[PDB]
Amino acid sequence: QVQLVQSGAEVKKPGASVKLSCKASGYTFTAYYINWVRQAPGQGLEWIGRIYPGSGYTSYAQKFQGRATLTADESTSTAYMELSSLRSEDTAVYFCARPPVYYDSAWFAYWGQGTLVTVSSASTKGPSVFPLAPSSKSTSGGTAALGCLVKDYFPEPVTVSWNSGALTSGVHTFPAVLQSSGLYSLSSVVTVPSSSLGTQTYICNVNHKPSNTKVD
Amino acid sequence: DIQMTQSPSSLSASVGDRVTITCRASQSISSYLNWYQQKPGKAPKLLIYAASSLQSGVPSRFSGSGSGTDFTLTISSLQPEDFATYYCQQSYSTPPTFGQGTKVEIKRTVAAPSVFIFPPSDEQLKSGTASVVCLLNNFYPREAKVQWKVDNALQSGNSQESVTEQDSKDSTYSLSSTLTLSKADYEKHKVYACEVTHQGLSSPVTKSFNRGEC
Amino acid sequence: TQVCTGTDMKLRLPASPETHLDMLRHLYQGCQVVQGNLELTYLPTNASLSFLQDIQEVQGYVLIAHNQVRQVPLQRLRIVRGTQLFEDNYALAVLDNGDPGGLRELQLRSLTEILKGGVLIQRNPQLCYQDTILWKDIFHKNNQLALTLIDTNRSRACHPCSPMCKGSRCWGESSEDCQSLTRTVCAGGCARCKGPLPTDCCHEQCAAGCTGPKHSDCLACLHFNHSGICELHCPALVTYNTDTFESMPNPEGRYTFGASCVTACPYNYLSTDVGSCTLVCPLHNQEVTAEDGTQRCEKCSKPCARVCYGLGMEHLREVRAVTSANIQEFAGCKKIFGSLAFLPESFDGDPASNTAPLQPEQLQVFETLEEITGYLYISAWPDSLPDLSVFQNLQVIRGRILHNGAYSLTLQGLGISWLGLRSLRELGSGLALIHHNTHLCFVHTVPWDQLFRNPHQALLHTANRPEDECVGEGLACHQLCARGHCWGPGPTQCVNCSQFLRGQECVEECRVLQGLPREYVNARHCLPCH
Ligand SMILES: *[C@@H]1O[C@H](CO)[C@@H](O[C@@H]2O[C@H](CO)[C@@H](O[C@@H]3O[C@H](CO[C@H]4O[C@H](CO)[C@@H](O)[C@H](O[C@H]5O[C@H](CO)[C@@H](O)[C@H](O)[C@@H]5O)[C@@H]4O)[C@@H](O)[C@H](O[C@H]4O[C@H](CO)[C@@H](O)[C@H](O)[C@@H]4O)[C@@H]3O)[C@H](O)[C@H]2NC(C)=O)[C@H](O)[C@H]1NC(C)=O
Ligand SMILES: *[C@@H]1O[C@H](CO)[C@@H](O[C@@H]2O[C@H](CO)[C@@H](O)[C@H](O)[C@H]2NC(C)=O)[C@H](O)[C@H]1NC(C)=O
Ligand SMILES: *[C@@H]1O[C@H](CO)[C@@H](O)[C@H](O)[C@H]1NC(C)=O
Structure with missing residues (x-):
């Protein structure tokens, strides 16, 4: 399969640099333009620049001719996007895409699992995991609700799953909300049958990359 | 840079209806337009590149047309799987620019919210601060209101709601509120209620519980 | 021959576009090494450039500009020395190729060496694979600071390289268009190599x-x-x-x-x-x-004797044309070291210095001239003078300096009726361009092949007076002209005199004993005796 895997979903201090990698596979990496598009939370798409691996030829926009250095390795098949000086307005989710058939065309298919980049001065804190035990009040006729709770962590995001990605049927993961302290918080519940309450065990999987925390 | 403008900004229609999203350019574009479909939490997918030319894999119900200033994205039969923010992109000159996006959300029949309330964990009681979370599940539309009545007394301001995106399957939203308080202000009352006013409800559904009763 | 001389016209539009392609065909056909610049400009979409296919080396720069051709066959071009540089920095300039016409692929699959100069590729709406090439490998080790100004402003989509191209570096879409690295992959400190070992x-x-x-x-x-x-x-x-x-x-x-x-x-x-x-x-x-x-x-140990210099040499280096402010410096010159250019500005004087415009009588200064080392350029000539008979004693035009690096003899836009260069018997090098001379005849009566000294030479001629009109009127070679070769009318313009030339006029027989002072014979030349 033709895939693009990005890595570096972390938070950086304002003014510092950040190098985002973009792994490639399933095709000749040097044969197609690897361009970068960013999108702020709840905003539109913005095109940074493109680069042709094998030659190293780059094409930037006037907004990023001072920053955003692009590279490429034939041996490791990686794009390695890198900004020099970060701003508060440079907080976005960075994607790496490539054209479908032609190498220089400006329509993008085969995108990658983008990595979010937060630019703020506050410290990186780990999330707290609290369970939501279903009582007699939460026992419906044939169904029952239960979930985990993530509270007070400064940088997004968090990968929340159930049974290592086995229990996905009837699951709603809520988006995080910014509290008074400036620390996000969200929830994630699962609609399980009441007849199968005491039959199966339910564990929430909370994965936080910016602080490297895995609590189950 | 060439400014791309779409219309409308938001749109709602039922399953089977046709959708017309108009994209306007601030410069004459010779059919160098591209369309995308970005679902929440995922990267966009190339729907229709270079005006009319459709992309492989993309359903045939997606058609593109237009030239010069105005264009048009068309969905002959709207489906629940078509819930996403649609962007248009010009490929005329560096840099390629996008629009603000057209967030199209489909429409279904009225669905009543499944009200559920969970007591604050005992592990959160030893922390010094406690909060209460209520659950509203699988309801359309997303027009709802949740009031926190503690001992028959409204507690507003100290609550934050978090509503998910529209489901791609049954087209139903889900809401979650959080009553942020302290432990010193927590154990002075016993009854915590969850009152919801929704379209699919003839009377405000109130499901409560009592502290220290399990 | 294997070695040809380039041009020097740059971006300047060809005076005779009807013969512009025939020029390039005469210069580079069979040529493998180009001494000078390879300038390919203003070539129509229907042009056959199959004469460029042998060119392996270019000494100067390579200019490919303002062409409608989709293909320029330079697959054997191995090295550009860049001793001369377009705009003094570029050894390879590819500019404004388009108008579907337009250069599609460079296809320089042998170009692995550029000794001096950079690469300029801009405004090519159809060109592809320009940005797929590691140009840092083509540049020499002593030229690693060579500039690279390349524009990918395209009006068409481009297929990727053929799967054979390892690294996806190509000069086109074929498997033979793959770029072969010879510098960046070398082991140790090798400037050039055939592999990583x-x-x-x-x-x-x-x-x-x-x-x-x-x-x-x-x-x-x-x-x-x-x-x-x-x-x-x-x-x-x-x-x-x-x-x-x-x-x-x-x-x-x-x-x-x-x-x-x-x-x-x-x-x-x-x-x-x-x-x-x-x-x-x-x-x-x-x-x-x-x-x-x-x-x-x-x-010379002792300071050399006075030599007559033409335009482009020494004190006449920056002088555009022969005017009335330098006409006297050619007086008594048998051999001119340089060139002679006659522009329209030759025959209009200087009112601010009360200098009279060059007069047709003053042109008789060149009557002693027998040899030009550079070239002869005439784009303007007095309407009174029916021919170029002021150069009637001119024997050799060396062509060591060429107009636009190509032409040793240019006659254009003149009102001359015939040529009158009866002594001209050699064009050492360069092409001859005689076009747009309305009343000019006696062009096909000239044995041009006898004048040339290499097969890269020819006569490019158009828009002159139709030979059919010439032969219709009594404008043919004199009877005494051998093999019908003449530079003009009368027995005073014969290339070869059939018998007994007297003075400057061909006669049928000298008067050895007939009355004209018993003219004695000396090598087919009638001379007075007693
Ligand atoms: C450079 O070189 C290119 C070729 O490599 C030259 O391009 C050709 O130029 C010639 C010039 O004579 C063109 O021929 C003329 O074409 C026109 C236009 O043809 C159109 O209209 C026709 C209407 O009847 C139509 O039939 C044509 O369709 C063609 O293609 C289909 C394909 O299926 C084929 O089935 C048809 O049979 C046709 O062949 C096309 O749509 C045409 O009107 C001209 O007719 C004149 O001449 C005839 C005979 O002299 C005369 O009887 C008519 O009354 C009229 O006066 C003429 O045929 C040719 O089409 C060009 N080809 C291409 C591919 O461009 C180019 O000219 C060269 N340039 C230079 C500067 O030399
Ligand atoms: C150097 O010059 C020699 C001779 O001029 C070239 O050798 C000739 O190469 C051609 C093409 O391969 C052959 O047809 C000839 O028979 C060769 N002649 C001789 C005498 O060998 C040689 O290619 C030149 N080398 C370079 C690097 O230019
Ligand atoms: C690209 O070329 C077109 C015409 O060929 C021109 O209008 C446009 O300005 C060019 N763009 C750039 C960035 O040079």
Whole structure:
């Protein structure tokens, strides 16, 4: 399969640099333009620049001719996007895409699992995991609700799953909300049958990359 | 840079209806337009590149047309799987620019919210601060209101709601509120209620519980 | 021959576009090494450029600009030395190729060496694979600071490289268009190599690439090619015996001609004491012409005698045309070292200095002229004068300097009726361009093939007076003109006189005993006696 895997979903201090990698596979990496598009939370798409691996030829926009250095390795098949000086307005989710058939065309298919980049001065804190035990009040006729709770962590995001990605049927993961302290918080519940309450065990999987925390 | 403008900004229609999203350019574009479909939490997918030319894999119900200033994205039969923010992109000159996006959300029949309330964990009681979370599940539309009545007394301001995106399957939203308080202000009352006013409800559904009763 | 001379017209539009393509076909056909610049400009979409297919080396720069062609066959172009540079920085300029017409692929699959200069590729709406090339590998080690201004402003989509291209670096869409690295993959400190191994490293004297470690396995020479051998210098013409250091001639000695070692300088070239082939002698030298026809440069101990310089030489270097402010400096000149250009501005004077415009009578100054080293350019000529008979004694135009690097004889936009160059018997080099002369005849009556000295020469002619109109009227060669060869009407314009030329007029028989002072015969020339 033709895939693009990005890595570096972390938070950086304002003014510092950040190098985002973009792994490639399933095709000749040097044969197609690897361009970068960013999108702020709840905003539109913005095109940074493109680069042709094998030659190293780059094409930037006037907004990023001072920053955003692009590279490429034939041996490791990686794009390695890198900004020099970060701003508060440079907080976005960075994607790496490539054209479908032609190498220089400006329509993008085969995108990658983008990595979010937060630019703020506050410290990186780990999330707290609290369970939501279903009582007699939460026992419906044939169904029952239960979930985990993530509270007070400064940088997004968090990968929340159930049974290592086995229990996905009837699951709603809520988006995080910014509290008074400036620390996000969200929830994630699962609609399980009441007849199968005491039959199966339910564990929430909370994965936080910016602080490297895995609590189950 | 060439400014791309779409219309409308938001749109709602039922399953089977046709959708017309108009994209306007601030410069004459010779059919160098591209369309995308970005679902929440995922990267966009190339729907229709270079005006009319459709992309492989993309359903045939997606058609593109237009030239010069105005264009048009068309969905002959709207489906629940078509819930996403649609962007248009010009490929005329560096840099390629996008629009603000057209967030199209489909429409279904009225669905009543499944009200559920969970007591604050005992592990959160030893922390010094406690909060209460209520659950509203699988309801359309997303027009709802949740009031926190503690001992028959409204507690507003100290609550934050978090509503998910529209489901791609049954087209139903889900809401979650959080009553942020302290432990010193927590154990002075016993009854915590969850009152919801929704379209699919003839009377405000109130499901409560009592502290220290399990 | 294998070696041809480039041009020097740059972006300047061709005066005769109807013959512009026929020029390029005469210069480069069969040519492998281009001494000078390879300038391909203003070529229609329906142009056949199959004469460029042999060109391996270009000494100057390469200019491909303002063309409608989709393909320029330069697959064998191995090396661009860049001794001259377009705009002084670029060894390869690809500009404004378009108007579907337009250059699609460069296809320079042999170009692996650029000794001096950068690459300029801009405004090519159809060109692809320009940004797929690692240009840093083509540039020489001593040219790693060479600029690169490349524009990918395309109006079409481009297919990727063929799966054979490892690294996806190509000059086109074919499998043969793959770029072969010869610098960036070299082991150790090799400037050029045939692989990533130290055994694949090529000799220091090699240029483009190698086929082996030897200095006889090169694809191109960095300096000089000594009969299949790449060397830093040619073997000196002089050997000094280590006792007393007397100079004795070297049997293995060679002259430096371009980037190759020759046993003898080619035609129309001069041999110097240093051991080189030039078109212009060094300072304070004179041209000693041997009896066998060969010419050489010799240095003078005592200051040289006064020499007559033409335009483009010495004190007339920056002078555009022959005017009435320099017309007297050609007076009494039998041989002119330089060129003669007659523009429209020649015949309008200077009101601010009360200088009268050049008069047709003053042109008789060139009556003593017998040889021009540069070229003869006439784009303007007095309507009164029916011919170029003021150059009636001119015998040789060397063409060591060429107009736009191509033409040694240019006659355009004149009102002359015939030529009148009865003494002209040699055009040492360069092409001849005679076009747009409304009333001009006696052009096809000239044995042009006799004047040329190499097969890269020809006569480009158009828009003159139709030969059908010429022969219709009584405008044909005189009966006494041998083989119907003449420069004009009358028996005073015969190339070859059938019998007994008297003075400047051909007669049928001299009066040896008929009354005209008993004219005695001396080598077909009638002369007075007693
Ligand atoms: C450079 O070189 C290119 C070729 O490599 C030259 O391009 C060709 O130029 C010639 C010039 O004579 C063109 O021929 C003319 O074409 C026109 C236009 O043809 C159109 O209209 C026709 C209407 O009847 C139509 O039939 C044509 O369709 C063609 O293609 C289909 C394909 O299926 C084929 O089935 C048809 O049979 C046709 O062949 C096309 O749509 C045409 O009107 C001209 O007719 C004149 O001449 C005839 C005979 O002299 C005369 O009887 C008519 O009354 C009329 O006066 C003429 O045929 C040719 O089409 C060009 N081809 C291409 C591919 O461009 C180019 O000209 C060269 N340039 C230079 C500067 O030299
Ligand atoms: C150096 O010059 C020699 C001789 O001029 C070239 O050798 C000739 O190469 C051609 C093409 O391969 C052959 O057809 C000839 O027979 C060769 N002649 C001789 C005498 O070998 C040689 O290719 C030149 N080398 C370079 C690097 O230019
Ligand atoms: C690209 O070329 C077109 C015309 O060929 C021109 O209008 C446009 O300005 C060019 N763009 C750039 C960035 O040079």
